Amino acid sequence: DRINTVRGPITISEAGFTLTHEHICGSSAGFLRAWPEFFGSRKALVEKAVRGLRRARAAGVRTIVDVSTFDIGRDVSLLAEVSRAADVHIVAATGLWFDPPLSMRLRSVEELTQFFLREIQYGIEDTGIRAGIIKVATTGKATPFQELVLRAAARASLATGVPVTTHTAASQRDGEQQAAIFESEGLSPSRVCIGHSDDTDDLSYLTALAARGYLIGLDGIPWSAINASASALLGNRSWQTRALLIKALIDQGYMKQILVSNDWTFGFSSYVTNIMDVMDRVNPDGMAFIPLRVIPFLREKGVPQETLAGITVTNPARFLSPTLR
């Protein structure tokens, strides 16, 4: 039941404090290799990533789950280099996000299942690095292709025991549609995380999924823009409003169904040019925002350490551990 990382298999006890939805670099397939000067240089991106992960480590984080898929420009060699120099375990991902190229979008469910399985059972590229999580996406009502991906992600999870994590348009209640698709394939709700759930205030949506066994991804707490580009991406809602949703779900009793993270990055190319510079101004803490700002905020709101350590250590370790239920 060992969890696969970019450096090799680790046990449940070695995982520790885990951020379930992070990115070393938010890019596009082949971009980092073709145009490293966009990030200054590859060396400059590595140096920035090592510094940010070491800051996260000093604050308490032992493992981060890089949910960067093929189309988000996942570079496992970059992930391996920064994991080694920072002494933070990184769990790599397979799956598809909302920017698949023609070679991915014209594939059948059988073919996409084989691709996700290739990255989990054999390895990513020629590196032998196996993925320990599957990332998928929907932005409103699922397109015939997005449904096909969710099904392929479910089938790949049922043959390996590896978990599935999603990107949602939470306000449009995507988690319910994704649920219906995952359940029709026979996937256990305990192997799924309905991510970006901190984008909505609808508690009757979050509790309904958490009661069925789904893990709720309140994975982007520092995302706030309190000018168009930063506002359209990060949103109008504050970090406190997103952190009060962690509190609200513990008050509903569904404490064991919570996964917290930052959804941060050290390189961003899939959006406008200076978005990374604006993001580093909004949150200078980076990935260290959860143990330095969110946890002490929840402690001052009435949530004990036994509960917060269960959300950060026990919940991700149970989520990442290969099993069918």
Amino acid at 255: M
Strand partners, 4: 9
Q: Which does 324 bind (CB under 5 to 8 A by kind): Co ion, a second copy, none?
A: none
Could you tell me if 181 and 146 are in contact, meaning their C-beta atoms sit under 8 angstroms apart?
no
Nearest to 63 by CA among 85, 87, 45, 99: 87
Could you tell me if 174 and 217 are in contact, meaning their C-beta atoms sit under 8 angstroms apart?
no
- Annotated binding residues for Zn(2+), as ranges? 21, 23, 135, 167, 196, 263
Q: Which does 167 bind (CB under 5 to 8 A by kind): Co ion, a second copy, none?
A: Co ion
Out of 119, 199, 219, 285, the only residue in the binding site for a second copy (CB under 8 A) is 119
Nearest to 279 by CA among 267, 295, 293, 291: 267
Out of 17, 70, 182, 289, the only residue in the binding site for a second copy (CB under 8 A) is 70
Pick the stretch among 11-19, 27-35, 149-157, 167-175 that binds Co ion (CB under 5 A).
167-175
41 lies in the site for a second copy, by CB under 8 A: no
Out of 2, 54, 55, 118, the only residue in the binding site for a second copy (CB under 8 A) is 118
Nearest to 82 by CA among 116, 120, 32, 118: 32
117 lies in the site for a second copy, by CB under 8 A: no
Pick the stretch among 53-61, 108-116, 164-172, 206-214 that binds a second copy (CB under 8 A).
108-116
> What angle do the packed helices 203-210 and 239-250 form, to 10 degrees?
50
1 lies in the site for a second copy, by CB under 8 A: no
Least distance in angstroms from the C-beta of 325 to Co ion: 26
Q: Which does 49 bind (CB under 5 to 8 A by kind): Co ion, a second copy, none?
A: none
- Nearest residue (CB) to a second copy, 29 versus 294: 29
In angstroms, rounded to a whole number, what is the distance separating the alpha carbons of residues 309 and 17? 8
With CB under 8 A, what is the number of residues at the site for a second copy? 34
Residues contacting 315, CB < 8 A, separation 6+: 215, 256, 257, 258, 259
30 lies in the site for a second copy, by CB under 8 A: yes
Out of 14, 81, 99, 201, the only residue in the binding site for a second copy (CB under 8 A) is 99
In angstroms, rounded to a whole number, what is the distance separating the alpha carbons of residues 232 and 235? 6
Pick the stretch among 7-15, 22-30, 145-153, 201-209 that binds a second copy (CB under 8 A).
22-30
In angstroms, rounded to a whole number, what is the distance separating the alpha carbons of residues 251 and 247? 6
Out of 167, 173, 191, 293, the only residue in the binding site for Co ion (CB under 5 A) is 167
Q: Which does 70 bind (CB under 5 to 8 A by kind): Co ion, a second copy, none?
A: a second copy
Q: Which does 40 bind (CB under 5 to 8 A by kind): a second copy, Co ion, none?
A: none
* Near a second copy in 239-298, by CB under 8 A: 269-273
Using CB under 5 A as the criterion, which residues of the chain lie in contact with Co ion when the complex forms?
167, 263
Using CB under 8 A as the criterion, which residues of the chain lie in contact with a second copy when the complex forms?
27-31, 33-35, 37-38, 70-71, 73, 99, 101-104, 106-108, 111, 114-115, 118-119, 124-126, 269-273
